[PDB]
Design an enzyme around this catalytic site. Sequence first.
Site, PDB file in Angstrom:
ATOM      1  N   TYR B  54       0.699  25.164   4.035  1.00 25.04           N
ATOM      2  CA  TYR B  54      -0.393  24.836   4.948  1.00 25.04           C
ATOM      3  C   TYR B  54      -1.699  25.307   4.328  1.00 25.04           C
ATOM      4  O   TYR B  54      -1.818  26.474   3.938  1.00 25.04           O
ATOM      5  CB  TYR B  54      -0.196  25.489   6.331  1.00 25.04           C
ATOM      6  CG  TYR B  54      -0.034  24.443   7.407  1.00 25.04           C
ATOM      7  CD1 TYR B  54      -1.078  23.561   7.699  1.00 25.04           C
ATOM      8  CD2 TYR B  54       1.160  24.303   8.109  1.00 25.04           C
ATOM      9  CE1 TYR B  54      -0.937  22.565   8.646  1.00 25.04           C
ATOM     10  CE2 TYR B  54       1.307  23.311   9.060  1.00 25.04           C
ATOM     11  CZ  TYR B  54       0.258  22.446   9.327  1.00 25.04           C
ATOM     12  OH  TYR B  54       0.419  21.442  10.265  1.00 25.04           O
ATOM     13  N   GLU B  56      -5.170  24.188   5.520  1.00 22.96           N
ATOM     14  CA  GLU B  56      -6.338  23.701   6.248  1.00 22.96           C
ATOM     15  C   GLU B  56      -7.608  24.360   5.739  1.00 22.96           C
ATOM     16  O   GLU B  56      -7.624  25.553   5.418  1.00 22.96           O
ATOM     17  CB  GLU B  56      -6.202  23.992   7.738  1.00 22.96           C
ATOM     18  CG  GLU B  56      -5.132  23.201   8.445  1.00 22.96           C
ATOM     19  CD  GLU B  56      -4.819  23.798   9.792  1.00 22.96           C
ATOM     20  OE1 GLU B  56      -4.464  24.994   9.826  1.00 22.96           O
ATOM     21  OE2 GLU B  56      -4.938  23.099  10.814  1.00 22.96           O
ATOM     22  N   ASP B 200     -16.287   0.563   0.405  1.00 26.83           N
ATOM     23  CA  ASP B 200     -14.846   0.789   0.389  1.00 26.83           C
ATOM     24  C   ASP B 200     -14.322   0.120  -0.871  1.00 26.83           C
ATOM     25  O   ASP B 200     -14.127  -1.100  -0.905  1.00 26.83           O
ATOM     26  CB  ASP B 200     -14.203   0.220   1.646  1.00 26.83           C
ATOM     27  CG  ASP B 200     -12.725   0.498   1.728  1.00 26.83           C
ATOM     28  OD1 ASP B 200     -12.117   0.926   0.714  1.00 26.83           O
ATOM     29  OD2 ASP B 200     -12.171   0.282   2.819  1.00 26.83           O
ATOM     30  N   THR B 226      -8.648   3.974  -1.529  1.00 24.54           N
ATOM     31  CA  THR B 226      -7.261   4.350  -1.730  1.00 24.54           C
ATOM     32  C   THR B 226      -7.077   4.793  -3.175  1.00 24.54           C
ATOM     33  O   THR B 226      -7.790   4.351  -4.079  1.00 24.54           O
ATOM     34  CB  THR B 226      -6.332   3.172  -1.457  1.00 24.54           C
ATOM     35  OG1 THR B 226      -6.741   2.074  -2.279  1.00 24.54           O
ATOM     36  CG2 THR B 226      -6.376   2.768   0.007  1.00 24.54           C
ATOM     37  N   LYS B 229      -4.116   1.629  -5.423  1.00 26.82           N
ATOM     38  CA  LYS B 229      -4.211   0.235  -5.848  1.00 26.82           C
ATOM     39  C   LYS B 229      -4.510   0.176  -7.345  1.00 26.82           C
ATOM     40  O   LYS B 229      -3.697   0.652  -8.143  1.00 26.82           O
ATOM     41  CB  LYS B 229      -5.249  -0.513  -5.010  1.00 26.82           C
ATOM     42  CG  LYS B 229      -4.871  -0.546  -3.529  1.00 26.82           C
ATOM     43  CD  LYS B 229      -5.876  -1.314  -2.690  1.00 26.82           C
ATOM     44  CE  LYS B 229      -5.428  -1.387  -1.251  1.00 26.82           C
ATOM     45  NZ  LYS B 229      -5.137  -0.038  -0.729  1.00 26.82           N
ATOM     46  N   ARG B 235       0.141   7.309  -2.979  1.00 30.50           N
ATOM     47  CA  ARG B 235      -0.354   6.653  -1.773  1.00 30.50           C
ATOM     48  C   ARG B 235      -1.160   7.641  -0.948  1.00 30.50           C
ATOM     49  O   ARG B 235      -0.606   8.593  -0.386  1.00 30.50           O
ATOM     50  CB  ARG B 235       0.815   6.086  -0.977  1.00 30.50           C
ATOM     51  CG  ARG B 235       0.400   5.215   0.209  1.00 30.50           C
ATOM     52  CD  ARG B 235       1.595   4.409   0.746  1.00 30.50           C
ATOM     53  NE  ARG B 235       2.053   3.468  -0.271  1.00 30.50           N
ATOM     54  CZ  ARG B 235       1.472   2.294  -0.500  1.00 30.50           C
ATOM     55  NH1 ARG B 235       0.442   1.911   0.249  1.00 30.50           N
ATOM     56  NH2 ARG B 235       1.924   1.502  -1.470  1.00 30.50           N
TER      57      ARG B 235
HETATM   58  C1  LIG Z   1     -10.334  -2.185   1.391  1.00 31.00           C
HETATM   59  C2  LIG Z   1      -9.245  -1.342   1.986  1.00 31.00           C
HETATM   60  N1  LIG Z   1      -9.608  -0.228   2.631  1.00 31.00           N
HETATM   61  C3  LIG Z   1      -8.657   0.509   3.212  1.00 31.00           C
HETATM   62  C4  LIG Z   1      -7.316   0.200   3.203  1.00 31.00           C
HETATM   63  C5  LIG Z   1      -6.347   1.045   3.983  1.00 31.00           C
HETATM   64  O1  LIG Z   1      -5.636   1.932   3.105  1.00 31.00           O
HETATM   65  P1  LIG Z   1      -4.232   2.537   3.577  1.00 31.00           P
HETATM   66  O2  LIG Z   1      -3.868   3.543   2.511  1.00 31.00           O
HETATM   67  O3  LIG Z   1      -3.240   1.393   3.685  1.00 31.00           O
HETATM   68  O4  LIG Z   1      -4.469   3.203   4.953  1.00 31.00           O
HETATM   69  C6  LIG Z   1      -6.903  -0.954   2.504  1.00 31.00           C
HETATM   70  C7  LIG Z   1      -5.493  -1.328   2.406  1.00 31.00           C
HETATM   71  N2  LIG Z   1      -5.385  -2.791   2.468  1.00 31.00           N
HETATM   72  C8  LIG Z   1      -4.004  -3.119   2.168  1.00 31.00           C
HETATM   73  C9  LIG Z   1      -3.921  -4.334   1.285  1.00 31.00           C
HETATM   74  O5  LIG Z   1      -4.962  -4.822   0.835  1.00 31.00           O
HETATM   75  O6  LIG Z   1      -2.826  -4.846   1.028  1.00 31.00           O
HETATM   76  C10 LIG Z   1      -7.901  -1.732   1.893  1.00 31.00           C
HETATM   77  O7  LIG Z   1      -7.611  -2.873   1.218  1.00 31.00           O
END
Ligand SMILES: Cc1ncc(COP(=O)(O)O)c(CNCC(=O)O)c1O
Lengths: 428, 428
Positions: B54, B56, B200, B226, B229, B235
């Site tokens: 933990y 925090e 984002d 994220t 990707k 993740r």
């Molecule tokens: C542009 C964009 N912003 C946030 C998320 C959410 O992320 P997560 O880890 O799933 O909570 C995504 C995810 N989109 C999933 C996808 O494009 O398949 C995202 O694209």
Amino acid sequence: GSMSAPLAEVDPDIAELLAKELGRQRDTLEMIASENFVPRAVLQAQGSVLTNKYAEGLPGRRYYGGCEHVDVVENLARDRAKALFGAEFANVQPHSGAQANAAVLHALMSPGERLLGLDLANGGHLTHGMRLNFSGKLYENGFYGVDPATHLIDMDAVRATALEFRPKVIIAGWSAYPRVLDFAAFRSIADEVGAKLLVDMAHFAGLVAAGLHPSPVPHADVVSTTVHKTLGGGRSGLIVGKQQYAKAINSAVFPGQQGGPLMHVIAGKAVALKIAATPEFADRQRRTLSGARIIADRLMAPDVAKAGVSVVSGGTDVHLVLVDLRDSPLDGQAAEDLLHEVGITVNRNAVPNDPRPPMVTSGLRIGTPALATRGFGDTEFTEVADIIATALATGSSVDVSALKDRATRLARAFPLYDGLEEWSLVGR
Amino acid sequence: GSMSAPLAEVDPDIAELLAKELGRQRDTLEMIASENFVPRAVLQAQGSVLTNKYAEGLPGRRYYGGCEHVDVVENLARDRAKALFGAEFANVQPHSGAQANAAVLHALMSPGERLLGLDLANGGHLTHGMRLNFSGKLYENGFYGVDPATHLIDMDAVRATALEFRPKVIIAGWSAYPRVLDFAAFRSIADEVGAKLLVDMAHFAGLVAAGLHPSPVPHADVVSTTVHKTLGGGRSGLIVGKQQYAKAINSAVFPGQQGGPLMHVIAGKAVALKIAATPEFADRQRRTLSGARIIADRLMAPDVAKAGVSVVSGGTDVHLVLVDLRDSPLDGQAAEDLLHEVGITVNRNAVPNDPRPPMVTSGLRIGTPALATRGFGDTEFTEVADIIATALATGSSVDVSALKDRATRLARAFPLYDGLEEWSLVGR
Ligand SMILES: Cc1ncc(COP(=O)(O)O)c(CNCC(=O)O)c1O
């Protein structure tokens, strides 16, 4: 290239820190009441390639191709959660205890509506209404507390508060409370005022699973929990509850609060829920409870009482002991520091009407789950109790060297993660 | 007993599903544009005992003791994020991309204030204002879209919308847009109307790290992403941005939105950020982009166009191809299932003014990052493109076995996670 290279070659600094943290867990006696040690099988699941799968949606109802296997994983976790806790539905996607609670409140109420929870200084969690958390930012908050004399929640006082405040949602649950909640009374009060009842069982879910704490599931509309406290699993959240809330809760988790779930962590939830049904797990919860009672009993002996140290509520029925230091020369921070010098990790804890500042406190929270998982039984908790009692009754001039030796002997007698350095990611 | 037993003994069902999912990732050609394959070192970090801690708070500002090693882990992740992206601060605790965005909006706006994002049917994410997500439930939403003729975002139209809507926060970002955003124009617009600019960059963060996509960090107030990707990590989420927002963002992550962070996952973030600075990673991003362009070019051939299949915007400059099926007998689900049968895993995807139901869609999203990580180059993506083109042009009467054999040959030529069954949790 680096796709197949070991961590020790790719990132020596992080590899070294992983080893140091494992060494710290091995060398210390962990008594933070919210901490535990996951089993090997949960480590393996959390280190699995299931991290690579996007699986927004529900099993068999995903926004992505290729989810056939993670769908079975998630259904195993859901079915095991429902069976273990006797619940009508489960959602196994919450990333954490906080995210579980955010989704429940999203499902059950709207911004501006009234939330009633246990006050932070009286043992509540920050997601039960603290003004900087979403639970305080989005909702109108009311609080109940514990009786100043008994340190028990007074359900007539809770009822009186609910009648005056008229909450949309009542939270029963706690991060630092030493007794059993009266779930039947909470349900009666919720019914009387037309509120939904959320029980946040994060701390005591493992006791519930082993039949050693009354279950909130018969009484609550929705039950949230962490998977990683007494339940003994990987760091994550879980929701179970009555069938009429399943659609609202599922939608609140996704797309209400989250996106893709952590399928590797959900695989570990399935593992933890299966382990939580075993006799070995039940014995571990028994040793958790007996150990906490042994510590509480030792700390109520005359030598500790005469030093101005007392046990909140005069005992415990759960996995922790709350210590009151208002009459002691030690404050909560000083006692936490002193026990750290001996090798025991606890945390300071606010007492109601605490005469000391909130980051100092006049209390301690001492937990037994992690040491029970490590293998401690009544003999070992008797020794731990005497170490703690000697430190708290004597104060900062205590013979720390002797207590440290005793704590180290316990740590060496009960090796932690013995063999981890040889365990494989998958297989045997 | 169960604390040290392998997964295969504790939970054979989950052990078997881990093997099946690994087999699926090996046997299919994974072309979900938001997926990737994490390296061995990230698997090891996510399977580490850091789940037990933990922590925090922030490094050096924790609530519990014993954080001396996880503090260094988190500082390494923060410092590497700031260095890789050229950002003034970073918060590495968000559990997910959704939780990163929830914290940013928590920090930058109040419930009821106005949010402007890319419409979901025009390529935006559900956390950019969708009615059932927190971004739509808490805030007053406005949307911009793409030009109907070119399917490009028209910044004159975005400016006109911002001038009329007067948003508190403008989001630039997307989950299904095949071209490069004009961050300078977004900043000009945000300044003109007094809005904060959130970018984002979830999908293109790895392209940015490799210098193959303009960075939003110079222009944005705050950048969310994220890690999993194109950045290729575990993740989870991440926030970086300008120093004047550090306090608000840190507080919005904890205690605003979350509780304890996932320190094992944060250790993996540090690893992924270090890998993202390497030439091997940059070459992987180069092959990602070239492969996507090869697929887009092939799908614009007359045989595909004659079948009613088109490429949104007439090409791509990023890691994905968006396929429009409005004039095709295939809908999005049918095409996703057909590609699945020939050994290629994608997801259906919405398109503007979709004539099909939303769970079905008239589109496909095809992405190259995972196959580039697997080692595919231009020769392999040429074959992948031809397989997809043949399936989409022929539809239900295509020779599924002939195409599946071609996909299987590619998978066999590029083994995935070769040796995983022998890798250790720690060490080699
Ligand atoms: C542009 C964009 N912003 C946030 C998320 C959410 O992320 P997560 O880890 O799933 O909570 C995504 C995810 N989109 C999933 C996808 O494009 O398949 C995202 O694209």
